[PDB]
Amino acid sequence: ELIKENMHMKLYMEGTVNNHHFKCTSEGEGKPYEGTQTMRIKVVEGGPLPFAFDILATSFSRTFINHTQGIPDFWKQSFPEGFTWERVTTYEDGGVLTATQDTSLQDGCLIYNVKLRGVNFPSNGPVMQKKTLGWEAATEMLYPADGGLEGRGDMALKLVGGGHLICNLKTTYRSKNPAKNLKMPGVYFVDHRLERIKEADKETYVEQHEVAVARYCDLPSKL
Numbered sequence: 001e002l003i004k005e006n007m008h009m010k011l012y013m014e015g016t017v018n019n020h021h022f023k024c025t026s027e028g029e030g031k032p033y034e035g036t037q038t039m040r041i042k043v044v045e046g047g048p049l050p051f052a053f054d055i056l057a058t059s060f061s062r063t064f065i066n067h068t069q070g071i072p073d074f075w076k077q078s079f080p081e082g083f084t085w086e087r088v089t090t091y092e093d094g095g096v097l098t099a100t101q102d103t104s105l106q107d108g109c110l111i112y113n114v115k116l117r118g119v120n121f122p123s124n125g126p127v128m129q130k131k132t133l134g135w136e137a138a139t140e141m142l143y144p145a146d147g148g149l150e151g152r153g154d155m156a157l158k159l160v161g162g163g164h165l166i167c168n169l170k171t172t173y174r175s176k177n178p179a180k181n182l183k184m185p186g187v188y189f190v191d192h193r194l195e196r197i198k199e200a201d202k203e204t205y206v207e208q209h210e211v212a213v214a215r216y217c218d219l220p221s222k223l
Contacts, residue, residue: 002079002080002105003032003033003063003076003079004032004108005031005032005033006029006030006031006032007029007030007031007032007063007064007109007110008027008028008029008108008109008110009026009027009028009029009030009037009039009061009109009110009111009112010025010026010027010109010110010111010112011024011025011026011027011028011039011041011060011111011112011113011114012024012025012112012113012114013025013026013056013059013060013112013114013115013116014114014115014116015056015099015114015115015116015117015118016116016117016118017049017051017055017097017116017117017118017119017121018051018118018119018120018121018123018128020046020049020050020051021045021046022043022045022046022047022049023043023044023045023046024041024042024043024044024056024060025041025042025044026039026040026041026042026060027039027040028040030061030064031064032063032064032076033066034064034066035064035065035066035211035212035213035214036064036066036209036210036211037061037064037209037210038197038207038208038209039060039061039207039208039209040205040206040207041060041205041206041207041208042204042205043203043204043205047201047202047204048201048202048203048204049203049204050128050130051118051121051127051128051130052126052127052128052130052131052132052157052203053199053203053206054127054132054134054135054157054196055089055095055097055118055121055127055157056116057134057135057194057196057208058087058089058099058155058169058194059087059099059101059114059116060112060114060208061110061112061210062074062075062083062085062103062173063075063076063103063110064210064212065190065212065213065214066212066213066214067213067214068213068214068215069215069216071185071188071214071215071216072182072183072184072185073214074142074149074173074175074182074184074185075103075173077175077180077182077183078103078175078176078177078180079105080105081175081176081177081180082102082103082104082105082176083103083173083174083175083176084100084101084102084103084173084174084176085099085100085101085171085172085173085174086098086099086100086101086171086172087099087100087151087169087170087171087172088169088170089167089168089169089170090167090168090170091121091127091165091166091167092165092166092167093121093122093125093165094120094121094122094125095118095119095120095121095122095125095127095167096118096119096120097116097117097118097119098116098117098118099114099115099116099117100114100115100116101113101114102114125165126157126159126160126165127165130203131159131160132157132158132159132160132165133158133159133160134157134158134194134195134196135155135156135157135158135194136155136156136157136158136164137191137192137193138153138154138155138156138191138192138194139153139189139190139191139192140152140153140169140171140189140190140192141153141187141188141189142185142187142188142189142190142214143186143187143188144184144185144186145172146172147174147178148172148173148174148175149172149173149184149185150170150171150172150173151169151170151171151172151173151190152168152169152170152171153168153169154166154167154168154169155167155168155169186216188214188215188216188217189214189215189216189217190212190213190214190215191212191213191215192210192211192212193210193211193212194208194209194210195208195209195210196208196209197209
């Protein structure tokens with residue numbers, strides 16, 4: 001089996017948010033089977049960013065989700081070929097961020113390539129004004145659909161002074177070997193905690209940590 005108790009990752013990101021173009025790279029590692037990982041990210045082009053780095057946080061790692069209770073790991077089963085995802089995140093103040101990621105496994109290292117585009121972030125809003133303080137924990141609902149898996153979930157971005165701006169995520173996850181016979185799961189959930197550990201140089205260097213666990217709904221069913 002190709003996914004080994006400890007893994008390294010490399011990431012290239014390019015995007016544009018409200019007409020501002022930028023690139024990031026990052027390097028990290030994690031414990032795929034624990035559900036834990038750490039990324040050290042550099043804005044290498046278009047920095048410093050004139051928007052909140054937080055809107056990029058989710059676009060930096062599906063291999064590193066601890067699967068409890070035998071839920072088949074959609075993303076771990078996809079190697080060596082790997083997988084992609086495509087997401088649209090819609091903020092309640094009109095901002096819309098679309099992201100595409102390709103995940104591959106080359107020479108024992110996980111390699112991420114992301115493209116994204118953000119539009120209609122209000123000029124006066126907390127993203128464009130950099131008034132945000134990270135994400136709350138969140139739960140994503142996942143279910144088979146269209147040959148792949150779909151994810152749906154809201155997330156809450158913390159605002160300076162209290163307050164939250166909410167967005168809703170719609171994701172499609174596809175395996176790169178479609179022929180591969182998958183054990184698919186029912187409907188399930190992944191709990192995510194995405195934390196900024198450190199930053200420097202006007203968010204031009206950022207250390208991010210994520211814990212993510214896959215689980216069924218532990219409630220009794222009168223059915």
